[PDB]
């Protein structure tokens, strides 16, 4: 239930490290749900939002990079 009056892509992801499971209300995108780090797609939505979430996950994999294989599944 964390609202964001500002966008700031990297700040969202950086702080999502602690809030990994929940939902945010960014004023630029809207209601964004994410579970254990992975920002989820509510639906198709507008390309603006969809691509943003993709680049957020991109940024996630940039800060993470490792991705420790435990249950990633074949």
UniProtKB/TrEMBL annotation:
InterPro entries: DUF1107. Gene3D superfamilies: so0334 like domain (3.30.1910.10). This is DUF1107 domain-containing protein.
């Amino acid at each position: 239930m964390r609202v964001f009056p500002v966008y700031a892509p990297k700040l969202i992801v950086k702080h999502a490290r602690i809030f990994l499971t929940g939902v945010i209300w960014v004023k630029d995108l809207g209601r964004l749900e994410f579970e254990k780090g992975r920002f989820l797609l509510p639906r198709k939505s507008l390309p603006k939002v969809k691509q943003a979430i993709l680049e957020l996950n991109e940024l996630i994999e940039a800060q993470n990079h490792q991705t420790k294989t435990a249950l990633e599944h074949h």
